[PDB]
Amino acid sequence: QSALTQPASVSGSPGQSITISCTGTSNDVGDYDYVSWYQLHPGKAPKLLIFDVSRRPSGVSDRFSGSKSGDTASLTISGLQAEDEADYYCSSYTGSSTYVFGTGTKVSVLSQPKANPTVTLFPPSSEELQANKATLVCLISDFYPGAVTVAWKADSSPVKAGVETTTPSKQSNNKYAASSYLSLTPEQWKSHRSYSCQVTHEGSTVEKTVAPTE
């Protein structure tokens, strides 16, 4: 069945309460009480926090709470602590006797003040084009917290195929950097007026544009 929709990124300061939504359909979240929530720290195994929509295993802090209204389940994290910075996934059993998962939410606990990313977009090099290939490279630096979404545009139309983007990691200053790649043929690169990299961070979007005519 179809993945449950979660927000990509949620942030809060310590002491704050935050909510993470998880939207499905009649056949999973809607008509049943079959929703779970898991916390995933990098390299550690997933950890159960909530099952049957709202039951908490013993050993899970009571700061974690689950609920459901309609086709949308929600995980609330009260009194945010720095240890809560992780990826969070919902899941559900279904009326077709399967399990589906959510798309995942990165929770950031703001330990530092927000920092907007600097975006730098590289067009394909002449050397790559002579080799009958083309890669656009979008470099994202100097931002905090370390969560971004990246959208690519050909002219004004969305480009989905051939995109890969890294998970943000720390630079040697203490802010984050990430990177996104658009692979195209030389023909597709030449066949459009411009290509843009759109970087969305903490509710604002920075855009950069290159053109095969520059």
């Binding site: 589906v100 998962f101 490279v137």
Partner: protein, 228 residues
Amino acid sequence: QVQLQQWGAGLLKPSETLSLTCAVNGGSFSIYYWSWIRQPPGKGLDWIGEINQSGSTNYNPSLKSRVTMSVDTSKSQFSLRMTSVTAADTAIYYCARAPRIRWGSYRLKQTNFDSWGQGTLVTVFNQIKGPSVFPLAPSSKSTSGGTAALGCLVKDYFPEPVTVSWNSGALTSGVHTFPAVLQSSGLYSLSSVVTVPSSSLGTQTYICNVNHKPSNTKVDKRVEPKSC
């Protein structure tokens, strides 16, 4: 809950068979289901399927053509086989318990997963392959700070890792080398970038030294500005 221990070969070539095994410690199969789940480096979690100790299985509709699970009651082990793999199957594979129980007649509880194994990293590709290296000529994207960014694109290699130096190791300040992305090919690409002062461009030299030790590929690429 229980403790799941899992193993199996994680380095595969296209068209081969993934075969992973999970062992139950601190409990038994009982009335429960036992499951395989994966996390591909881009995507979120995929439920692969489940099996109980009597051999009843339920599988993910998009994977069932290639997936079969088995159970060995005597050993307290269950297994995943996935045939004809491609790089689309590259992922961390976890086993876990799905301790569903009936409460009356219409009512299921503990519809969650809970005994998550530590994961097996599976990669799928054909052969060792060295990178293609291209320059990322300076773009000048901080006007306030009078700084530019320049770099090297290290493209289409397998397996990890790749190490990038600049100027044979003399240049480390302002260098940032990103984690690799995995492409749909099953090959990797990464980039390494230097933040430098704009006034240095065209007078200081910048050369990136790529060494992909898996394939004994070393490449030096000069990175110079496009246009003054």
